[PDB]
């Protein structure tokens, strides 16, 4: 006993969509259920890394206040809209990407310069509607590698950086039982993700990172 | 499911909602019929209403 | 009472807060936003809605 | 003890007559949470008497609402004592203040 | 004896039978109402804050 | 003549501290009253009842 | 410095004497002894033939055995907190215990 | 990825009782993170050491008294439960204890051994007042961890324990309150580095050296599931 506290199995993947699951655990200790079910969710949250939109370069624009025409929504938004588009980097710190398109209608993601070494991991994301016979449109997107949610703090246009692919995670705690007590919890992990991980295996990262950090003390 | 929401339109006159729940619920419990739909070992009554 | 006093707190304005006034594209950023303590809970912000 | 009173429990608690008040003033003799005895002085005491007050004090027992009601002692063995010292708790009291 | 195999019967038994709950005096109907239970270690019953 | 008092220890004479949740070791937003309450056990004990 | 001191457990089950000598190891180890055992001195193994008939048939006869095990373990560093400790800690009593000073 | 990992630099027993530690450097809310985590664990999941039956000699039951000193019964037990002690690789221990003659009665009565260590020898059991008085007990300590109540320990039993005998609450979790601070500190000329301290207080058996580790252990072997999925 002195030291064989109880462990979980994953009681299901309870799989909702590939953008979203629930993985549950049970049982786990006393209390526990917070301090592994926040402890990775203020991990995921914050500090998983990866590759997101960091700067933009329409043609010929000084601030996102320019409304230029030709372009249904105004630049304000194209400028949010692209730092809803997810993407994967391959070994490099920083990479920029060239987009344009002509013809009345709409823009994708799907109309990039795909270099291969790059992948739009969701291509059929829209990023703007066109609205004259002449309108094209043609832009620098710079794309990075980095670490957790950064804010607007820190031509070109700044944005703030979505460089973690979990969209939300939430938790929580509820009665468990075994043959003889019920004040045992069981866990209730949430999570939607961007795509770019399927989020069963996110928290397999995410464990892996706070594992990292006990395998000095660990004995 | 927890409650009758579809088998109260089925069942405009209400009341009839409990009696022909009951009477399902006899063919199942005393007629000796069982359930199609697809149960996980699960107690039947949320069963009996659906009709 | 206790609930509609926390709906009460959670959705004021303060004139001033902590990451007051950016652009976002959902309620789900806007949640990592305060989560994260990046964004106080009452601060004015545009949002993308549907 | 209450931290914040009015000072009236050093009467509530007295004047119930539940906490074991000292008859005349004296020395403690003995003490062990049973009895509790004191050596009476000389200037309180009767001339023919042995001079010694015994307090047998009341243990477990219930009461008429089957709340227990046990007395403690509050002296020690040797402490002096004055005529109408606390020397034992009651129920709810120590040192002899009120303390719900 | 309350053996280690009743509670599995009866969070078997209860697995949805509702239970009535009612306070008194009971002005009106909805002074009656019904829940489904669920169990607790304690002794207290467990009700719910809306109602 | 209370304030005094928590000066003359070395508390906070606003009576309020800071608080911090062991769920998660967050800080409330704004401090919250702390102090030494008498509370009595009544006796209508629950197992006298059930 | 004083020499060294060794004692003896003496026990009829075995099991006991290695719980009598895991407490004095662990004794002399937690105040510091060079502590240097514990030699297994040899089984004595007493044995016995009793007639089982209260009558005559010599011939049905039982034959038991008692088996004294003994440890001898030597401190030869006494720390005087090893003097106290030996001193006032005993066992169960199917271990006997004798002490030789030098 | 530019995740520097702790180490446990330093170590400040203050008290007999009290200390502090911290771990350092560490990555952006690592130090709240851990900060949390670890002083949950230190709270629900050390291992201790507990009092846990009592047997006096010509006692009966807790309610009784008896002659010749200070206390109830029952504050005895109340002061017993709070006595800590370790014991060296054992899962339970029996002491004796015996006085005689008028004064206190302090745990530096028990009949030491090696293998049993007290944090406090003059934390106080009752007092003898009369000069013929005496009390002998066997103190029955026990390992465990958390807290289990003699109500529940008696139904788990399932033997009927004789007459005569005492039972306490068992209360082995050994850390009374745990603190933790974060703050930015001095590596690789660069900001935002947390030297995370722990500071916390305890009964006194164990060493924060050993309680951060298993704690950490802990922790690292609860997550094992969820890399195991």
């Not at chain 4, 009767?46 to 001079?51: N, R």
């Given at each position: 006993s002195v030291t064989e506290f109880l462990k979980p199995r994953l009681?299901?993947?309870?799989?909702?969509s590939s953008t979203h699951a629930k993985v549950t655990l049970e049982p786990?200790?006393?209390?526990?259920g917070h301090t592994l079910g926040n402890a990775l969710r203020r991990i995921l949250l914050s500090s998983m890394p990866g590759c997101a939109v960091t700067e933009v370069e329409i043609?010929?624009?000084?601030?996102?206040?320019?409304?230029?025409?030709?372009?249904?929504?105004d630049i304000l938004e194209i400028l949010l809209n692209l730092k809803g588009l997810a993407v994967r980097v391959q070994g490099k710190d920083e990479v920029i990407l060239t987009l344009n398109k002509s013809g009345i209608g709409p823009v994708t993601a799907?109309?990039?310069?795909?270099?291969?070494?790059?992948?739009?991991?969701?291509?059929?994301h829209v990023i703007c509607h066109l609205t004259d016979e002449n309108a094209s449109i043609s832009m620098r997107i710079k794309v990075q590698r980095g670490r957790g949610y950064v804010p607007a703090s820190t031509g070109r246009l700044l944005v703030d950086a979505?460089?973690?692919?979990?969209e939300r995670i939430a938790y929580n705690v509820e009665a468990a039982r075994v043959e003889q007590r019920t004040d045992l919890d069981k866990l209730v992990i949430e999570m939607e993700t961007?795509?770019?991980?399927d989020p069963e295996e996110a928290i397999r990262r995410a464990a892996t990172i706070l594992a990292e950090q006990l395998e000095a003390f660990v004995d | 499911r927890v409650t009758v929401q579809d088998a109260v339109e089925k069942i405009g006159n209400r009341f009839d909602l409990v009696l022909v729940a009951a009477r399902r619920a006899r063919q199942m419990q005393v007629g000796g019929k069982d359930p199609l739909v697809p149960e996980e070992n699960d107690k039947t009554t949320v069963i009996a209403l659906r009709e | 009472q206790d609930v509609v006093l926390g709906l009460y707190y959670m959705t004021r304005d303060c004139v001033?807060?902590?990451?007051?006034g950016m652009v976002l594209t959902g309620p789900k950023e806007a949640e990592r936003l305060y989560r994260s303590g990046?964004?106080?809970?009452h601060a004015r912000v545009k949002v993308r809605i549907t | 003890k209450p931290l914040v009173g009015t000072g009236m429990e050093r009467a509530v608690a007295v004047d119930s007559g539940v906490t074991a008040v000292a008859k005349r003033g004296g020395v403690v003799q003995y003490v062990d949470a049973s009895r509790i005895v004191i050596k009476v002085n000389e200037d309180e005491m009767?001339?023919?008497?042995?001079?010694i007050d015994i307090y047998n004090l009341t243990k477990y027992t219930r009461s008429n609402q089957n709340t227990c009601i046990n007395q403690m002692p509050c002296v020690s063995l040797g402490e002096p004592v004055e005529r109408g010292d606390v020397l034992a708790d009651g129920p709810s009291t120590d040192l002899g203040e009120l303390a719900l | 004896r309350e053996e280690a195999v009743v509670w599995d019967i009866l969070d078997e038994v209860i697995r949805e039978h509702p239970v009535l709950l009612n306070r008194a005096p009971?002005?009106?109907?909805?002074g009656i109402q019904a829940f489904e239970p669920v169990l607790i270690e304690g002794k207290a019953i467990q009700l719910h804050p809306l109602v | 003549e209370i304030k005094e008092l928590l000066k003359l220890g070395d508390?906070?004479?606003?009576?309020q501290i800071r608080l911090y949740d062991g769920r998660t070791g967050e800080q409330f937003e704004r401090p919250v009253t702390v102090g030494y309450m008498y509370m009595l056990k009544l006796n209508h004990l629950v197992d006298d009842k059930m | 410095q004083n020499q060294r001191i060794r004692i003896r457990l003496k026990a009829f089950d075995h099991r006991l004497i290695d719980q009598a000598t895991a407490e004095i190891v662990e004794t002399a180890k937690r105040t510091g002894a060079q502590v240097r055992g514990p030699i297994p001195l040899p089984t004595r193994k007493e044995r016995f033939t009793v007639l089982?008939?209260?009558?005559?048939?010599?011939?049905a006869r039982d034959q038991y055995e008692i088996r004294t095990h003994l440890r001898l373990v030597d401190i030869?560093?006494?720390?005087?907190k090893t003097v106290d400790a030996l001193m006032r800690l005993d066992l169960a009593a199917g271990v006997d215990v004798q002490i030789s000073l030098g």
């Open positions: 009681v299901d993947i309870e799989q909702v786990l200790e006393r209390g526990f043609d010929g624009v000084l601030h996102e206040y320019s409304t230029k025409e030709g372009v249904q929504e799907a109309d990039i310069t795909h270099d291969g070494d790059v992948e739009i991991v969701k291509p059929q979505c460089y973690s692919p979990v961007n795509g770019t991980i | - | 001033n807060a902590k990451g007051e990046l964004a106080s809970l | 009767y001339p023919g008497e042995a001079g | 009971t002005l009106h109907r909805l | 508390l906070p004479t606003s009576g | 089982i008939s209260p009558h005559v048939n010599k011939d030869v560093e006494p720390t005087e």
